C-alpha cells in the first residue's frame, strides 16, 4: 500500500520511525496521492519541507522547488545531499559551466537530478523556458512546489513582483500537482495565494493551529484599576507561586513600549517584593548580556523588556507574559505572549489595555508607515499594518473567547478553550468591566 512505502522511505532515507505529528503525516499522504494541489502553513521547526521532499522521491519524475532567495535554498540542498538524495540548485550565483552542466542534465531522458531548487528570477528567464518545455513534453515533471508562497500577496509583509509570474507557470504545468508552503498567512493572504498561483479546487489545506490549551488569556483595563503597579505584582505572585514549597518557581516577562516605562516598572515591581530588572537598547551591550544571564539562570525571576527581547532567547518555564502596553499587532502579541509555557505547564498571558495606550501606538504606527512611504511610495501592506493593530484593539474592546479571537485573525477553527480565558471562565464579569470602561467613554 502507499502507507507501507511512505513509512519505509521515511525510515530508509530520512531516518525517522514515525512522523512528528499526524498533521505532518496527513499533508505528506495528500501530496503523494497527487490528485489535488496542496497548501501547507506550518511554523518554523515543524518539518514542513518533508511534506514535498519525501513525496518527490516516491514519484516517477522531477520535483521543481521555487524558493525566493539562495540563503534559504542552500540550507535544504546541503541536508538533502547528506541523505544521499540526488538534488541540484539553479541560480544566477552560479558559473556558466555549472549552469550549463545542469541545463544539459535536465535535457536527458532520465536526468541525474530528482529535486531541482530554483529562484523565481531563473524560473522566468528566457534561458530556462525551453528546458522546462522539454521537461513537460517528456512527462518528467511530477510536482511544482512554491516555498514562501505568502510572497505573492501584497497584504503579506514580504511582497515580491517576481512571484506574480508563478501563476502563469502553474497554468503551463497543468498536468502536475502544485504544493505551496509558508509559516505566515492571514485568511486574506491564503485567498491571494490560491488565486494568484492559480491553485486548483479542491485545494487541500494543512495549517498548524495557534491554540495552546495551557495558556490563560485575559485583559485588564488600567483605567478601572486603583493600583495598576500593585495589580501586576499580584499577577506575577499568582503565576510564580504554583509550587509554594520551592518558594518562587519559574520566571516571567513584562513588555513595555518605552525604556523609561521599563526602568520605572522594574523599580515599582522590585519595591513591592518581586525582583525585576530592565532590558532595553539604552543599556550598554554588557548590561544587557548580564541582565539576560540573571533571568536565564533564575537569579532574577522577572525581566521588563522593550520589543528588543532576544529572538535566540527561549526559556521553558516562563510562568507569565504581561503586556503593560498593547503591542503594534495581533501577530506581535501572539508571538510575544507565546514565549510563555513552552514546558506545557499552566502559564498566564495578560494585556493591560488603556485607550490612551491605544492612541499613542495607533499614531506611532501611522508615523513610521509615513516615513516608509516617503522612501518607497505606496503599498497595500501599509493598510495591512494598520489592520494588524485594529485586530488587537478589537481583541481588548469586545466580549468573546480570547483564544477564539486570536484563531479568527490567523484563520484557524474555533479552538477548545476549557475555561482557558477570562470570558470563557466568567462571561458576566467581563461584561461588567467592559460596561465600566464605556462609562468613562461618555463625553
Amino acid at each position: 500500500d502507499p502507507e507501507r512505502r511512505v513509512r519505509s522511505t521515511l525510515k530508509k532515507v530520512f531516518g525517522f520511525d514515525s512522523f512528528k505529528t499526524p498533521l505532518q503525516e496527513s499533508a505528506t499522504m495528500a501530496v503523494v496521492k497527487g490528485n489535488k494541489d496542496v497548501f501547507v502553513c506550518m511554523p518554523t521547526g515543524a518539518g514542513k519541507s518533508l511534506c514535498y521532499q519525501l513525496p518527490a522521491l516516491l514519484a516517477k519524475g522531477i520535483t521543481i522547488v521555487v524558493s525566493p532567495l539562495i540563503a534559504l535554498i542552500q540550507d535544504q540542498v546541503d541536508h538533502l545531499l547528506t541523505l544521499k538524495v540526488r538534488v541540484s540548485s539553479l541560480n544566477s550565483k552560479l558559473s556558466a559551466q555549472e549552469r550549463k552542466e545542469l541545463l544539459a542534465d535536465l535535457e536527458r531522458e532520465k536526468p541525474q537530478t530528482k529535486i531541482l531548487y530554483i529562484t523565481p528570477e531563473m524560473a522566468a528567464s528566457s534561458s530556462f523556458q525551453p528546458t522546462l518545455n522539454s521537461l513537460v513534453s517528456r512527462h518528467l515533471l511530477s510536482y511544482l512546489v512554491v516555498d514562501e508562497a505568502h510572497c505573492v500577496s501584497q497584504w503579506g509583509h514580504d511582497f515580491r513582483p517576481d512571484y506574480l509570474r508563478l501563476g502563469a507557470l502553474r497554468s503551463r504545468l497543468g498536468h502536475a500537482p502544485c504544493v505551496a508552503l509558508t509559516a505566515t498567512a492571514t485568511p486574506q493572504v491564503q485567498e491571494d495565494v490560491f488565486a494568484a498561483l492559480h491553485l486548483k479546487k479542491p485545494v487541500a489545506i494543512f495549517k498548524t493551529p495557534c491554540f495552546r490549551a495551557n495558556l490563560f488569556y485575559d485583559v485588564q483595563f488600567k483605567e478601572l484599576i486603583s493600583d495598576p503597579y500593585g495589580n501586576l505584582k499580584d499577577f506575577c505572585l499568582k503565576a510564580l507561586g504554583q509550587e509554594a514549597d520551592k518558594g518562587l518557581s519559574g520566571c516571567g516577562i513584562v513588555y513595555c513600549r518605552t525604556r523609561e516605562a521599563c526602568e520605572q516598572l522594574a523599580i515599582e515591581l522590585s519595591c513591592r517584593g518581586v525582583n525585576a530588572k530592565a532590558y532595553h537598547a539604552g543599556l550598554k551591550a554588557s548590561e544587557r548580556t548580564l541582565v539576560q544571564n540573571d533571568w536565564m539562570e533564575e537569579k532574577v525571576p522577572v525581566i521588563v523588556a522593550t520589543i528588543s527581547f532576544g529572538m535566540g532567547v527561549d526559556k521553558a518555564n516562563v510562568r507569565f507574559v504581561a503586556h503593560w502596553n498593547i503591542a503594534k499587532s495581533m501577530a506581535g502579541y501572539y508571538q510575544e505572549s507565546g514565549r510563555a509555557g513552552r514546558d506545557g505547564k499552566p502559564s498566564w498571558c495578560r494585556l493591560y489595555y488603556s485607550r490612551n495606550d491605544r492612541d499613542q501606538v495607533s499614531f506611532l504606527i501611522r508615523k513610521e508607515v509615513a516615513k516608509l512611504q516617503e522612501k518607497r511610495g505606496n503599498k497595500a501592506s501599509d493598510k495591512a499594518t494598520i489592520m494588524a493593530f485594529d485586530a488587537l484593539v478589537t481583541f481588548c474592546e469586545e466580549l468573546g473567547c480570547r483564544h477564539a479571537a486570536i484563531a479568527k485573525y490567523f484563520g484557524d477553527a474555533l479552538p477548545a478553550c476549557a475555561k482557558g480565558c477570562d470570558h470563557c471562565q466568567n462571561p458576566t464579569a467581563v461584561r461588567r468591566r467592559l460596561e465600566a470602561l464605556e462609562r468613562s467613554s461618555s463625553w
Partner: nanobody, 124 residues
Framework: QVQLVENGGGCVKAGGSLRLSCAAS????????MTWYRQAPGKEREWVAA???????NYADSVKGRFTISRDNAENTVYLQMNSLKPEDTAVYYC???????????????????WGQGTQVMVS
C-alpha cells in the same frame, strides 16, 4: 465535504411573497461569494442576486427592489426575500458557495466551490 440545502419555496399567487433559506453544513470558516441562481424549466440558468463575505450585495435587473438577500453570519445561512412575485419568477432556486474555506481544529481543511440541491417555487 459541505452541504448546501435550500428551503422555503412553495406555490403562491402573483403579487404574493416567499422567503428562501439556504443552510450551509460542515466546518465552514468563510465563503467568498454566496449567489442565488434560478432555473425556469426550458430556459437557461439565471443569476438572481449575490452577497460577498462582508455583506456587499448585487441583484439582477429583472428582480431589483422586489428581491433582497442577507446573511445570518452566526448561522452561515443566507436568505432571499422575494416580494411582488410574477409568473416569470417560477423556477427551481439554488445557491453557489464560491470560495468556501473549510477547516477542522486538527488543522486539516479544504477550499472549494459548492452547489445546492434547490427548492421548487411556483407562481400562478
Amino acid at each position: 465535504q459541505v452541504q448546501l440545502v435550500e428551503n422555503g419555496g412553495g406555490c403562491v399567487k402573483a403579487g404574493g411573497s416567499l422567503r428562501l433559506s439556504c443552510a450551509a453544513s460542515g466546518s465552514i470558516f468563510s465563503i467568498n461569494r454566496m449567489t442565488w441562481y434560478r432555473q425556469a424549466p426550458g430556459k437557461e440558468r439565471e443569476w438572481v442576486a449575490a452577497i460577498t463575505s462582508g455583506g456587499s450585495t448585487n441583484y439582477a435587473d429583472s428582480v431589483k427592489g422586489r428581491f433582497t438577500i442577507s446573511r445570518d453570519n452566526a448561522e452561515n445561512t443566507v436568505y432571499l426575500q422575494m416580494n411582488s412575485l410574477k409568473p416569470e419568477d417560477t423556477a427551481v432556486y439554488y445557491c453557489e458557495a464560491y470560495g468556501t474555506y473549510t477547516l477542522a481544529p486538527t488543522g486539516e481543511g479544504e477550499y472549494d466551490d459548492y452547489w445546492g440541491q434547490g427548492t421548487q417555487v411556483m407562481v400562478s
